[PDB]
Amino acid sequence: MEELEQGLLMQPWAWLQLAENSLLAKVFITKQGYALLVSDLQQVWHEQVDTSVVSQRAKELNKRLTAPPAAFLCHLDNLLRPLLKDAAHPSEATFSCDCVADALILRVRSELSGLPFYWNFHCMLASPSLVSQHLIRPLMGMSLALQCQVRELATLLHMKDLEIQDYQESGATLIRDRLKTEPFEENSFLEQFMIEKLPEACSIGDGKPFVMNLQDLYMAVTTQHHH
């Protein structure tokens, strides 16, 4: 069922307030299972699931609950909103995380209608061909795309100075020395940046920045590949 994955790509990353840790992931749920991809910037993870295991794992955790194999994912799907949705939440849905040799358990455990709604995540070490299509490749295109964005944008900044010329080359002094801006010298600006902004701009932190101001692009790129 390669149907699942297909959607996992578009779905951008996000942040997740884990009980102790914190990792940016992406999940895609359907009526026939889900395909969650998580990572902590040090190593990716992934877990595929189909209706079968869903209901199976269901009673193995939500024993007091007897829910239809397909419907479960449907409800759980609506529960997972502490990412895309408001950064607030998720009520009492404290995400427990533990690691054990390529294994990563995302013991959700929240509330449902006022009852103890449980659910775990058996995400194994993500595969190469996978990481390549979610981090490496896609993201790589971003940096390669942003660079091309700076040049065309900065070069357009040159036209601003070029126009200012005719105004200045003919008296007509500005009305406020305030707006008066120094001529944009691509070489200059680009050398100081690596000594002022970059030092804290490159800071990947824990991936949080990545999600808060890049997905807008990320999605528009990863999708542009299969087209």
Partner: protein, 152 residues
């Protein structure tokens, strides 16, 4: 043993109403005396303490709001009851969109002596209804008389 009536509805007989009294002693955790009837036969069960403590833990529910839930599933769409005669087990789950789930359920034992049971209930159930008139009229007239007062 302060009682409590409230009528339930079994899916085992989606039409013929039922009744489930629950006489508790002060606290609800301590236990109580739940009983099922139908105007002809009865089924009494006794879920005291020690059996309730192992429910929110066996059902993962939090005791902080568990005992409270029992108050809306044993004395009033949510919450459904399913009890089969020969099964002699009062199975009930918390109904909700998509699905629902068990909450405990005791093995309500029948009663070879319906008469007395079906009676004791009505014998006392005539207060919450009739004896309520003693407090109903005391406000139906006292308040309908105070009228001319606020217009003085």
């Amino acid at each position: 043993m302060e009682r409590k009536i409230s009528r339930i509805h079994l899916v085992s007989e989606p039409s013929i109403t039922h009744f489930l009294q629950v006489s508790w002693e002060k606290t609800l955790e301590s236990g109580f005396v739940i009983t099922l009837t139908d105007g002809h036969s009865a089924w009494t069960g006794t879920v005291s303490e020690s059996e309730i403590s192992q429910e929110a833990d066996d059902m993962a529910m939090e005791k902080g709001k568990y005992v409270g839930e029992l108050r809306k599933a044993l004395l009033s769409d949510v919450y459904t009851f399913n009890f089969s005669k020969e099964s002699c087990y009062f199975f009930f789950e918390k109904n909700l969109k998509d699905v629902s789930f068990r909450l405990g359920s005791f093995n309500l034992e029948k009663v070879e002596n319906p008469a007395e049971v079906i009676r004791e209930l009505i014998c006392y159930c005539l207060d919450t209804i009739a004896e309520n008139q003693a407090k109903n009229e005391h406000l139906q007239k006292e308040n309908e008389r105070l009228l001319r007062d606020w217009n003085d």
